[PDB]
């Protein structure tokens, strides 16, 4: 092990004693991967064991199974779960794989050499050695590109991902014409993050998703080769801190942003996160309620078209500021919502009361009714309900869990970026420990006021 | 002794023993702080563990009843008791522990013993400070907490009908007390509470900014990453640079403390001032003298229906809180409100 | 010397009365923009239809209101989270009626506070100071972001965002508890502990140092030199190190505010606080009410009142 | 001739604090004063 007397780092900063220990650092990272793979496998098998075919996955508080279901495994027409053995296979595979990674980490943390540069030059690396650092980034960049292409392969081959917008009903579909038009693929990137544009969260077609992964997959592999055969340019070296903590701070900041984006994706996107498995989105639940009553009242004998509300802005239907006909009520804020159950009734100009008056299919109703009841609203003790509700329902939208968890994760990792980045910059300057007590810069600065 | 030499007395004996280096400073104040505090906190535990408010508030408030840490609470006595001190030997319990607990006697026991405990604690602060020969600024600062307790747990309850309308010793109980004040007293609009909130938020800002500044202007007095190791308990030089700190805040915020004394005096003045301000506001609520609403806007809203402000909106909310909790929050009133009489908005 | 270099120096100049920086280059204009509109709005802004129900709430000192009641009405519900730049509005009058100023102020304000955090580190690096003062300033910035951005987004409208006013702040807090029971959220509990504790620590630390330096000497060197340590009530050695004490003085408040901010963000995703309504049941099934149930009774009142005419359906899923 | 005779002392910061306080207090109670 190590002691503070020889490192200057206390036990609460012990892992910081592994910065220059390449061999030990390898074991630490490899081991941590084992933990991640372990949970993926363990929790998956736990979910499979606690899964029941009489209830939707979202009602069973399952988060991992929805991911496999979206990949198009053990799912059928309407999102109905045919079998769960595929899910069991995934858990078993990850769990056993975690053992291999665990052994490697333990070895590279005990028997393995504390450093590798002395023995294995290829693995041997020193922070600041930009060339080597860029090469390492390249290798991992290629790996991520291959992973994205594996998804693209599963979409156009080896079966297909589940398409909630599939024609004549939602089910797994083999993407055959993935969007490769740069304008469409990169359009999302330049889209405003505000309402309507929804930036990249707006992606509603699997064709763009698979096509976008095609673009990112290629660029990452090409970028890896570039970083493998190129060294940072003068401008970069003069505008970046070359240190392990600095490199970590860059990753911390990036992963923190990715966390926030993932939170929004799980809360707004319904394509990449099928509402059939992940449950309805906040906007989806609201629109579903308006549709549920609109249908019920219309059947009772109410003209939803000319039904003035208390404010006079239409009880069931109204016009979006843009002009599109939208459901009335506070759901006006979610007028930009788009779901496979509501699209058929829509048309060039907002909703089509013709479809609403006649052509409303029973499933369009049943689905909306189910979504309305299973809204994302919930409590920490898992007491399902808008609020001020009695303890009767035990359900919290999986979307809520992912959105809340990843948001908090992103926030902390951003704070970690600020901590590591600032310390890295201060370390480079040399004032990380504190003031010289003899070269205090302020004492040499202008007396200001 | 006594600048004259006097014969030692039993007091001198007891004095030296009480005022004697001991695992904990007993002193003379301890004779009040130790016993009262033990009974107060002990009573709160016993109450939250196995005591019910089924006959005082008709509510289950005990772990034995199945309540959790947040829900469990020592509820106040029934409003029928009014301002009765409710002693175990009182004309109510008449020396019946079971009934004394059922009548809500433990609440008065905890409050009374706790109140004297706080007095003993402040006296301990003066005692220890006098022995250390240091100005008792800490004791003067402890006046704000005591003032809050007296105004919220004594003055207010006394100004109202009875101890029933006093903060019950419980997490959820304090929460309902807070909500009650907004619905009935509009505590938020009260200017004194506003000054109090400013003090608590301001003190928190001062505490955080001071710790960050000092821990970030520290001098390099060590050769290791861990800066905490580089400090001597009996060091004379300041561990951090007041100058560097002054310039940073002078340029970042435009103003900055230049006297460490003034800085710390300000750190203790802000919080104490705020608490005392809020205490005066609670005194007004005790007599129902509250800044509930501005008549000028009330008259305008009545004459001009369209006119509306967040102030008018908050008034309506308070109206709902009072009508949709009075039936249970105040069982003595025995108010059965037909659902039609209750104020409900469109839908919902 | 290259003029751009000359400019770069002036920007990083520490001789400036108020240190300007690359962060300030964006912070100064953004905050100046937000301050100007806020002052004009809080004074002459016409009524705004925040609920998007064609019912405009009056604001600004000119249109009645007051210092306490006055506030900047949040954007209309109709706009929701849609970007509403002045140029998108057909007429400045429409921009005011729809509640555009609020969105503009918040956008030019959040950027400024984030740049303010970066400016803090910039000067610290220029002065040669440690780089974690901004981390402490991250706690307040995180809270502001949640009330003016994260929550508005989670709910799906800028109208949900806390109004820029005293009375508006109170309204935001009340409705929030009525729909999220923030009081029963463990994270908000941590935040209250942070502020209540921070005030306690501030009062004690201030009193100890004041009584000590009462006279450059260490904050407590005086009392330490006498050796009459108050271990009588301060029987501990954890904070014997001044650096250790000051660290805690910063960690306790900042970490608490971080939790309360995250708590608000989680509740923005409909993750309400503990719900123990009708949790205690007797033998035959009769519900034994508790303090929680009483809190629920109040929450119901605020709920049935909030947006008296802005609900056409029973469930408030929005 | 009272030796106890002394003089009050107001510094720039003290003056600023006082004026700031008297103004802030007015801004806070002005609304209530005009009710």
């Amino acid at each position: 092990g190590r002691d503070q007397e020889t490192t200057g780092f206390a036990w609460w900063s012990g892992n910081a004693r592994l910065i220059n220990l390449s061999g030990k650092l390898l074991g630490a990272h490899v081991a941590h991967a084992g933990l991640i793979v372990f949970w993926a496998g363990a929790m998956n098998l736990f979910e499979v064991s606690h899964f029941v075919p009489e209830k939707p996955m979202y009602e069973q508080g399952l988060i991992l199974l929805p991911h496999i279901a979206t990949l198009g495994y053990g799912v059928g027409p309407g999102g109905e779960i045919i079998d769960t053995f595929p899910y069991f296979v995934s858990g078993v595979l990850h769990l056993i794989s975690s053992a291999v990674l665990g052994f490697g980490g333990v070895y590279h943390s005990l028997i393995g050499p504390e450093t590798l540069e002395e023995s294995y030059p290829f693995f041997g690396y020193v922070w600041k050695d930009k060339n080597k650092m860029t090469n390492i980034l390249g290798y991992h960049l290629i790996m991520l590109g291959l992973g994205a292409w594996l998804l693209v392969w599963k979409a156009m081959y080896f079966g297909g991902v589940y398409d909630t917008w599939a024609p004549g009903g939602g089910d797994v579909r083999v993407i055959t014409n993935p969007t490769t038009n740069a304008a469409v693929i990169f359009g999302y990137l330049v889209k405003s993050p505000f309402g309507g544009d929804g930036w990249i969260c707006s992606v509603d077609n699997m064709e763009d998703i698979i096509g976008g992964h095609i673009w990112i997959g290629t660029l990452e592999i090409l970028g890896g080769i570039w970083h493998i055969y190129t060294t940072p340019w003068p401008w970069a070296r003069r505008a970046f801190v070359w240190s392990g903590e600095a490199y970590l701070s860059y990753s911390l900041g990036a992963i923190g942003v990715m966390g926030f984006i993932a939170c929004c994706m799980s809360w707004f996107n319904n394509t990449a996160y099928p509402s059939e498995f992940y449950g309805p989105t906040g906007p989806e639940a609201s629109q579903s309620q308006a549709f549920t009553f609109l249908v019920r009242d219309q059947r009772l004998g109410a003209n939803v078209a000319s039904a003035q509300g208390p404010t006079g802005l239409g009880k069931y239907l109204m016009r979006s500021p843009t002009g599109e006909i939208i459901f009335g009520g506070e759901t006006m804020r979610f007028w930009d919502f788009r779901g496979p159950w509501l699209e058929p009734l829509r048309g060039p100009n907002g909703l089509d009361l013709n479809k609403l008056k006649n052509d409303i299919q029973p499933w369009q109703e049943r689905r909306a009714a189910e979504y309305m009841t299973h809204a994302p609203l919930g409590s920490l003790n898992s007491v399902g309900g808008v609020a001020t509700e009695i303890n009767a329902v035990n359900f919290v939208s999986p979307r809520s869990w992912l959105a809340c968890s990843h948001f908090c994760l992103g926030f902390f990792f951003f704070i970690g970026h600020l901590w590591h980045a600032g310390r890295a910059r201060a370390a480079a300057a040399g004032f990380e420990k504190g003031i010289d007590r003899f070269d205090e810069p302020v004492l040499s600065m202008r007396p200001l006021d | 002794i006594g600048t004259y030499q006097e014969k030692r007395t039993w007091f001198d004996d007891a004095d030296d023993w009480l005022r004697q280096d001991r695992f904990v400073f007993v002193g003379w104040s301890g004779l009040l702080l130790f016993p009262c505090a033990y009974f107060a906190l002990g009573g709160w535990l016993t109450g939250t563990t196995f005591v019910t408010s089924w006959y005082t508030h008709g509510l289950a408030t005990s772990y034995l009843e199945g309540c959790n840490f947040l829900t469990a609470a020592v509820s106040t006595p029934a409003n029928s008791m009014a301002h009765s001190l409710l002693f175990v030997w009182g004309p109510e319990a008449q020396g019946d522990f079971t009934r004394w607990c059922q009548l809500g006697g433990l609440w008065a026991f905890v409050a009374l013993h706790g109140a004297f405990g706080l007095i003993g604690f402040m006296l301990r602060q003066f005692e220890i400070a006098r022995s250390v020969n240091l100005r008792p600024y800490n004791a003067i600062a402890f006046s704000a907490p005591i003032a809050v307790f007296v105004s919220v747990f004594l003055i207010y309850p006394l100004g109202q009908s009875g101890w029933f309308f006093a903060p019950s010793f419980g997490v959820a109980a304090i929460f309902r007390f807070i909500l009650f004040f907004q619905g009935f007293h509009n505590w938020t609009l009260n200017p004194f509470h506003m000054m109090g909130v400013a003090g608590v938020l301001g003190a928190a800002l001062l505490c955080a900014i001071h710790g960050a500044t000092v821990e970030n202007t520290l001098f390099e007095d060590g050769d290791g990453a861990n800066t905490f190791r580089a400090f001597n308990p009996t060091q004379a030089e300041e561990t951090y640079s007041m100058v560097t700190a002054n310039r940073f805040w002078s340029q970042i915020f435009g103003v900055a403390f230049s006297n460490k004394r003034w800085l710390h005096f300000f750190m203790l003045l802000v919080p104490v001032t705020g608490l005392w301000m809020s205490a005066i506001g609670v005194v007004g609520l005790a007599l129902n003298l509250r800044a509930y609403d501005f008549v000028s806007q009330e008259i305008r809203a009545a004459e001009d229906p369209e006119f509306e402000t967040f102030y008018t909106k908050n008034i309506l909310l308070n109206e709902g809180i009072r009508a949709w909790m009075a039936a249970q929050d105040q069982p003595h009133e025995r108010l059965v409100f037909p659902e039609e009489v209750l104020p409900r908005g469109n839908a919902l | 010397s290259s003029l751009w270099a000359r400019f770069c120096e002036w920007i990083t100049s520490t001789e400036n009365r108020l240190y300007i920086g690359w962060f300030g280059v964006i912070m100064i204009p953004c905050l100046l923009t937000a301050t100007s509109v806020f002052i004009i709005a809080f004074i002459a802004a016409p009524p705004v239809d925040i609920d998007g129900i064609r019912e405009p709430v009056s604001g600004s000192l000119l249109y009645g209101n007051n210092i306490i009641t006055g506030a900047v009405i949040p954007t209309s519900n109709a706009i929701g989270l849609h970007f509403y730049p002045i140029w998108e509005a057909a007429s400045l009058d429409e921009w005011l009626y729809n509640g555009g100023p609020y969105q503009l102020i918040v956008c030019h304000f959040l950027l400024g506070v984030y740049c303010y955090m970066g400016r803090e580190w910039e000067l610290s690096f220029r002065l040669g100071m440690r780089p974690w003062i901004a981390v402490a300033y991250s706690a307040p910035v995180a809270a502001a972001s949640a009330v003016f951005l994260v929550y508005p987004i989670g709910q799906g409208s800028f109208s949900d965002g806390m109004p820029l006013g005293i009375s508006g702040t109170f309204n935001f807090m009340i409705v929030f508890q009525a729909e999220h029971n923030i009081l029963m959220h463990p994270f908000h509990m941590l935040g209250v502990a942070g502020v209540f504790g921070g005030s306690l620590f501030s009062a004690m630390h201030g009193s100890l140092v004041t009584s000590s330096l009462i006279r450059e000497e260490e904050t407590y060197n005086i009392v330490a030199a006498h050796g009459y340590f108050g271990r009588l009530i301060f029987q501990y050695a954890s904070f014997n190190n001044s650096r250790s004490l000051h660290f805690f003085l910063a960690a306790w408040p900042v970490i608490g505010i971080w939790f309360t901010a995250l708590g608000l963000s989680t509740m923005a995703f409909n993750l309400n606080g503990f719900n123990f309504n009708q949790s205690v049941v007797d033998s035959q099934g009769r519900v034994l009410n508790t303090w929680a149930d009483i809190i629920n009774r109040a929450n119901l009142g605020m709920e049935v009142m909030h947006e008296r005419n802005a609900h056409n359906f029973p469930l408030d899923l929005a | 001739p009272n030796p106890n005779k002394q003089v009050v002392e107001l510094n720039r910061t003290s003056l600023y604090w006082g004026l700031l306080l008297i103004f802030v207090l007015a801004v806070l109670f002005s609304s209530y004063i005009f009710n």
Partner: peptide, 30 residues
């Protein structure tokens, strides 16, 4: 004119803050 009074108070407070930052006593003390 209550609004005029309120505006005066707000403006006055800001003015005090201004001089407190630019016309403040030179910080000769650390």
């Amino acid at each position: 004119m209550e609004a005029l009074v309120y505006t005066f108070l707000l403006v006055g407070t800001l003015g005090i803050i201004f001089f407190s930052i630019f016309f403040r006593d030179p910080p000769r003390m650390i």
